[PDB]
A paper describes a structure:
The COP1 E3 ubiquitin ligase is a central signaling hub that integrates inputs from plant light‐sensing photoreceptors. COP1 contains an N‐terminal zinc finger, a central coiled‐coil, and a C‐terminal WD40 domain, which is essential for proper COP1 function (Deng et al, 1992; McNellis et al, 1994). COP1 regulates gene expression and plays a central role as a repressor of photomorphogenesis by directly modulating the stability of transcription factors that control the expression of light‐regulated genes.
We mapped putative VP motifs in all these proteins and assessed their binding affinities to the COP1 WD40 domain. We could detect binding for most of the peptide motifs in ITC assays, with dissociation constants in the mid‐micromolar range. Next, we obtained crystal structures for the different peptides bound to COP1 (1.3–2.0 Å resolution, see Tables EV1 and EV2, and EV4) to compare their peptide binding modes. We found that all peptides bind in a similar configuration with the VP forming the center of the binding site (r.m.s.d. between the different peptides range from ~ 0.3 to 1.5 Å, comparing 5 or 6 corresponding Cα atoms). Chemically diverse amino acids (Tyr/Arg/Gln) map to the −3 and −2 position and often deeply insert into the COP1 binding cleft, acting as anchor residues. C Superposition of the VP peptide binding modes of the HY5 (green), COL3 (orange), and STO (gray) peptides depicted in ball‐and‐stick representation when bound to the COP1 WD40 domain as observed in their respective X‐ray crystal structures. As for UVR8, COP1Lys422Ala showed increased binding affinity for some peptides such as those representing the COL3287–294 and CO366–373 VP motifs, while it reduced binding to others, such as to CRY1544–552 and CRY2527–535. These observations may be rationalized by an enlarged VP‐binding pocket in the COP1Lys422Ala mutant, increasing accessibility for the COL3Phe288 anchor residue, and potentially abolishing interactions with CRY1Asp545.
Numbering used by the authors:
A (entry chain A): 351 to 363, 372 to 406, 411 to 630, 639 to 675
B (entry chain B): 287 to 294
Write the structure that this text describes.
């Protein structure tokens, strides 16, 4: 009730598929179709533009994830299938994991066991990696394309897997024989999974909904509607209270987790339907967020009264 | 292609 709008506080004037803050919310990184991981200083961006680091890649990038303990390390997944860990100080690749046989859509570094990272691919496998080992530590053969994988924020034993089979597969990595639970409800591929808390999981889908799930009691909680998402990866980011996602109308939407329709939205000639928001990232539990769209424009937005 | 969610 305290917010009704999103204010633009800074802008960096193609598609960015990932925008992510480092461990201390001091730097953020972008990646996508241009085969370039760019790192920016958040404070500089708000107070001014030039990245402080640029790392060229062989392939287009689908996802980034910063290491939660080695603050200068970042992982990427790319359209070749390769999962790379990078040192943004030296610009060198530290690990190049090459087992996936098709594009990898997602990579996530664990918060609680920071040397562990998980990836998912069109090859229908989930792979768990340790930065001290070259071969994967766990391999989960699934039936359908994997669009997103995410570690539980409280324990590296649990991952949520968003699948093109329309379900979220919630695994205990200590016994991958069967998932702990498979959450049905979305009518299309599950493009994102993100945790609000140890027990609260959100998902996005190209059925134009977000959904909230209780992964302790294995229950559906809430469905969120208002944005348009029938085709693209448009971004999902959550914190303790709010969900934000993109839209194929060139708008960013914000939902409070207790309310099914948006509390606010922001629109970034051509119709709205020609551009889409492609990446979003809250600055932890604050009302500030990073956003990017399919032209490559980046905006810093802040919830306001 | 780029940024398009898969199908089965």
């Amino acid at each position: 009730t305290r917010y009704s709008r999103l204010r633009v506080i800074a802008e960096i004037r193609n598609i960015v598929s990932s925008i992510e803050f480092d461990r201390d919310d001091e730097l953020f990184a972008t990646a996508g179709v241009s085969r370039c991981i760019k790192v920016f200083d958040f404070s500089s961006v708000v107070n001014e533009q030039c990245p402080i680091v640029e790392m060229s890649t062989r392939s287009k990038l689908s996802c980034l994830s910063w290491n939660k303990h080695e603050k200068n390390h970042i992982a990427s997944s790319d359209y070749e299938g390769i999962v790379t860990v990078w040192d943004v100080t030296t610009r060198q690749s530290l690990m190049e994991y090459e087992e996936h046989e098709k594009r990898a859509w997602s990579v996530d570094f664990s918060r609680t066991e920071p040397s562990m990272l998980v990836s998912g691919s069109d090859d229908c496998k989930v792979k768990v990696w340790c930065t001290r080992q070259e071969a994967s530590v766990i391999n989960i053969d699934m039936k359908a394309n994997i669009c997103c994988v995410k570690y539980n924020p409280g324990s590296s034993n649990y991952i949520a897997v968003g699948s093109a089979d329309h379900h979220i597969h919630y695994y205990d990595l200590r016994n991958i024989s069967q998932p702990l639970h498979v959450f049905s409800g979305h009518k299309k591929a599950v493009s994102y999974v993100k945790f609000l808390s140890n027990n609260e999981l959100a998902s996005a889908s190209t059925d134009s909904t977000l959904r909230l799930w209780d992964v302790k009691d294995n229950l559906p909680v809430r469905t969120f509607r208002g944005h348009t998402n029938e085709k693209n990866f448009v971004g999902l980011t959550v914190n303790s209270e709010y969900l934000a996602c993109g839209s194929e109308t060139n708008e960013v939407y914000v939902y409070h987790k207790e309310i099914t329709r948006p509390v606010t939205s922001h629109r970034f000639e051509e119709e709205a339907g020609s551009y889409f928001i492609s990446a979003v990232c809250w600055k932890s539990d604050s009302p500030t967020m990073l956003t990017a769209n399919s032209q490559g424009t980046i905006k810093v937005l802040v919830l306001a009264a | 292609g780029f940024g398009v969610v898969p199908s089965f």
